[PDB]
From a paper:
TS is an essential enzyme for DNA replication. It catalyzes the transfer of a methylene group from the cofactor 5,10-methylenetetrahydrofolate (mTHF) to its substrate 2′-deoxyuridine-5′-monophosphate (dUMP) and produces thymidine-5′-monophosphate (dTMP) and dihydrofolate (DHF). KSHV encodes functional thymidylate synthase (kTS), which shares 70% sequence identity with hTS.
In addition, a dual conformation was observed for the sulfhydryl group of catalytic Cys219, as shown in the electron density map of apo kTS. Arg200’ residue in the apo kTS structure was rotated approximately 145° to the opposite direction of the phosphate group and was not observed to interact with dUMP. For kTS, the Arg74 residue in apo and ternary complex did not interact with in dUMP, whereas the corresponding Arg residue in other TS structures was shown to interact with the phosphate group of dUMP.
Author numbering:
A (entry chain A): 51 to 333
B (entry chain B): 51 to 334
The structure:
Amino acid sequence: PHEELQYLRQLREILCRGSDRLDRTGIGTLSLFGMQARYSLRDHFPLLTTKRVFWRGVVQELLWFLKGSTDSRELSRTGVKIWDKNGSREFLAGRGLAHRREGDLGPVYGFQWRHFGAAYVDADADYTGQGFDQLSYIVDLIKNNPHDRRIIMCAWNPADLSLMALPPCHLLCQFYVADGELSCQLYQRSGDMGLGVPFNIASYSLLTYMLAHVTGLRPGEFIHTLGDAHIYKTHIEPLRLQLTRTPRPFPRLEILRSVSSMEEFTPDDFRLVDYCPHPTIRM
Amino acid sequence: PHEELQYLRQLREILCRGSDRLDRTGIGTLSLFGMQARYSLRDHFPLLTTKRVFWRGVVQELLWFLKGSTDSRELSRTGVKIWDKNGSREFLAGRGLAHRREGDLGPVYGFQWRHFGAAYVDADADYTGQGFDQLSYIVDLIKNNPHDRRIIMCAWNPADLSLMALPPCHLLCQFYVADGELSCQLYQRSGDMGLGVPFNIASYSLLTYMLAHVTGLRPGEFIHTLGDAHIYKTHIEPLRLQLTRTPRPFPRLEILRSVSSMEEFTPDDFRLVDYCPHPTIRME
């Protein structure tokens, strides 16, 4: 069976028996708690096909985080605008962080991944040698102690939450090596099933391809674990449309160059082969 | 189907198609990566029955960590010795922590839960007001913002790993409120299927009962998610024995008085009703 049917079955389950809840800000969702799906990375790349996923954004966003940036303006300069709302002075003001220049997202993914536990100043500060470099940590383990059970990169630092533009939805990823293959499990505390989750699956599957490439392994499996899996009520109609569509064969992902470090990738290193999605769906 | 069959199925799957791998310890395991099981908490308590689980240790250990302790001697004094080997001066020296007094585990669960991000000194230091109190954080959300999607307690701080007697296997728990019920998901990076996982299920199910009680909710479900789920090769024969056993109906758990704060529970407050397990299975 097509692995995309896991995601579609998750949508169906939430629509059928999801709890209807309002939060303190007055917005309603349907949700279920606790889900898991598995996507093979071996012969294909799991970029969903029942709608067109924003691959250009997936790639630029991940490279942006990997270099430790917390500046939405540097992502925006690449042509990808998905963090620009969160980096705006008016958004930051709304957060209670008015003391900032446009673009300064606070200690979000890039900072946590490369400098966990360091003292955040701003998005222009030099944090070289400060904090715990989780990316270097996991690359070393995959290379030199691949069977280790602590190959973890974590983005959740509760002491830093009040400084973040947004708290991370992707709390941590764990990696696993067996029989020459690298697998990844993501724990996602909150899954916006309509707008986010297809993009999220692509992000961590890409991360796994990159890590496998750098470490001389082949991609194995991506295990997607969800906490609060939800559908915003305004997304139900477009998702009803999506659910009428039959999945097409997943594309393949090729890496065009020998790359020795997780920091040396560029967007043009990635060749996506035979991606033929159904049309974009605006949620 | 009896919910304990999930755990037994996971054992069978690991034995059948688990990867045979050695660690840096040289000790071999069979393992699989990525599992999930669900245990209802509404009408029973999922204390496993195909072997006798150490309930008294479950209760004492959880209460010890909730109060923020990192002192294995404080647990030992209650009569529960499960952390004594890790808190011994011998083990700690083996870890490169030879300056520690006996019992000083470093910034393990108790410290992370109550003082995340604070600078660890030793097990005797007063950390009042230091770090992020995640226990107070989640209790406040469950009470006042129950549909929030950030009800999380996390024990993984990579910056503190070198100071810990042992790295935590239980990385985080997330809570969820619906229909007057409190549910919990545990992300466990490493599951010792033989010695640890039945005990682990009980720990976080108990935590969920306690939280539900303090916040005026009923317990819902416990969702157990595993990363590296493994069987130690020295555990193969005792687990093959366990697999020949049929689960008995789960016990029930009663809380015997009104408790208004997580820090106020004592082991006196819990009554396990109709626990009828198969005999204890010892494992190396």
